[PDB]
Ligand binder design. Structure first.
Ligand SMILES: Cc1ccncc1NC(=O)CN1CCCCC1
Ligand SMILES: Cc1ccncc1NC(=O)CN1CCCCC1
Lengths: 304, 304
């Protein structure tokens, strides 16, 4: 009973967080095996920020300029390299707390947990979605760069995001763990257009199934729709067009509840066209899109 | 930039979770030092649930009947005692991962993080409020009993909640770590009245300050109010009456934003009387009450 915006347990990631200082700037690093990963802008100063020449700035740095501290203990840096927008600092000691892990590039519309950190110390954990336009709407202040996003499958942490930037709009941008930005963004202090965003339709449908499972059923109706008809409504309301691949991933939820996907689409269509009429669904007064079908199945079945 | 429903990092609590089995039933236990704490209903069977005679059921149990497993390793139980609705199982080994901790009884209206667990394994973490009527609106399934709620202050975990029950309404009830229920509840399978609940006014005001800090300002107006006038509106809308102690705890937010507490009350009064007119505040289409003033200051300042 109940449905919450649940994050993965953060302990495995907490054991990987370190502080990285280069010159003036301190941000977070991720220590896995004998490598510390961090955003490359740790090597910048204020005059560099409008458009840093990262290759030249890094040429001025030596291994001993990267101060890496794992809580109390200092790590000895024996190599450094820049890969896309991340720095990889080779250290002489493997992290004893390295969990089983993978680096993955997530798709827009997928969700993950963020462990927000400052000075290598964890502050809090929250769940969010990668928007269809590749931005994230997080909670990050100065010093949070290098905090990571991740998912967990049994004892394996799949790292998918490293935080690099707050755009002038207050929205967030970052990279995969190979330093490739999600979206069109570059690590410099400039206004940068984020694409037109959309609402993640398959996630809203998954959340309506979570609602029915938990007893919030007022939005169920006597109607059905088709993919074509629903997609005309999705177009009007700036929702992602629904495909058979999305219908297929909703199969487990349709099977559990007995509510055909297109019948749930007809509920969503009515909610888009009429609003909530001052009512709530799972404690929300809007249509929630930060739960994937996998998240709903996991939370509704108690996966550990 | 940004404001999220952030939970505390769960690692310190993950290291304390164990599985407790007595007879048929398996639930979670909390291992701190050489004691494992768990809900006493682990000793019940189905015929007991309507009104268990806990003293008689426990008299049938011996130390060797409590199977306690910390992941892979088995703990040896050398004593057992029932304190209110919790069992305390003395074990022969102190938990090496015991963090600095306290047991606290929280006040209604305060918030905490829950580490939802099944079979002693963490599933996810979320933040919630203890309702004014002492219930919690969590996400808990069968097997989640014994999961705990907590707050963290530097390296000290203050445990405040242990999950015991899902009421027939789907709302949740539990105890402090001495086994005393929050609210009028008893650990038996019966319908039990939860008091009339209210919205946590001081938390809604704190969240409106978080909104202004993050740039959501549309609800600010040219008005002011008084405590008396605001409390007439709070009465109508089932909000907790605001006191000077609440105004005082909002001081830091009023000081940071320059918006007097009673002026923010006038914004809240207008929102209660007129609604949101289809707009959102910090991604919500309702007035959020699960952030205390302390939570807002912590998240807005990056406390670790
Ligand atoms: C202030 C803040 C708040 C939240 N998240 C990130 C930041 N800081 C930046 O974005 C700095 N930025 C990095 C990329 C190159 C230009 C400088
Ligand atoms: C099924 C479930 C889901 C979420 N949270 C808890 C439960 N289980 C119970 O409440 C069982 N209950 C314990 C107290 C004495 C009577 C039996």
């Amino acid at each position: 009973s109940g449905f919450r915006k649940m994050a993965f347990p953060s302990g495995k990631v907490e054991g990987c967080m370190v502080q990285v200082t280069c010159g003036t700037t301190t941000l977070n690093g991720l220590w896995l095996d004998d490598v510390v990963y961090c955003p490359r802008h740790v090597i910048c100063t204020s005059e560099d920020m409008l458009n840093p020449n990262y290759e030249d700035l890094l040429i001025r740095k030596s291994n001993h300029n990267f101060l890496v501290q794992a809580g109390n203990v200092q790590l000895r840096v024996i190599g450094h390299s820049m890969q896309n927008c991340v720095l990889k600092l080779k250290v002489d000691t493997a992290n004893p707390k390295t969990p089983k892990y993978k680096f993955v590039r997530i798709q827009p519309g997928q969700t993950f947990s963020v462990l927000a950190c400052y000075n290598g110390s964890p502050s809090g954990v929250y769940q969010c979605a990668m928007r269809p336009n590749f931005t994230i709407k997080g909670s990050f202040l100065n010093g949070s760069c290098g905090s990571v996003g991740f998912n967990i499958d049994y004892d394996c942490v799949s790292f998918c995001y490293m935080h690099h930037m707050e755009l002038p709009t207050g929205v967030h941008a970052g990279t995969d763990l190979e330093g490739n930005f999600y979206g069109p963004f570059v690590d410099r202090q400039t206004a940068q257009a984020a694409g037109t965003d959309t609402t993640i339709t398959v996630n809203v449908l998954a959340w309506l199934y979570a609602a029915v499972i938990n007893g919030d059923r007022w939005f169920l109706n006597r109607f059905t729709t088709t993919l074509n008809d629903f997609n005309l409504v999705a177009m009007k309301y700036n929702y992602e067009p629904l495909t058979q691949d999305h219908v297929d991933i909703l199969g487990p939820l349709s099977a559990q509840t007995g509510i055909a996907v297109l019948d749930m689409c007809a509920s969503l269509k009515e909610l888009l066209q009429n609003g909530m009429n001052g009512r709530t669904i799972l404690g929300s007064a809007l249509l929630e899109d930060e739960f994937t079908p996998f998240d709903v199945v996991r939370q509704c079945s108690g996966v550990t």
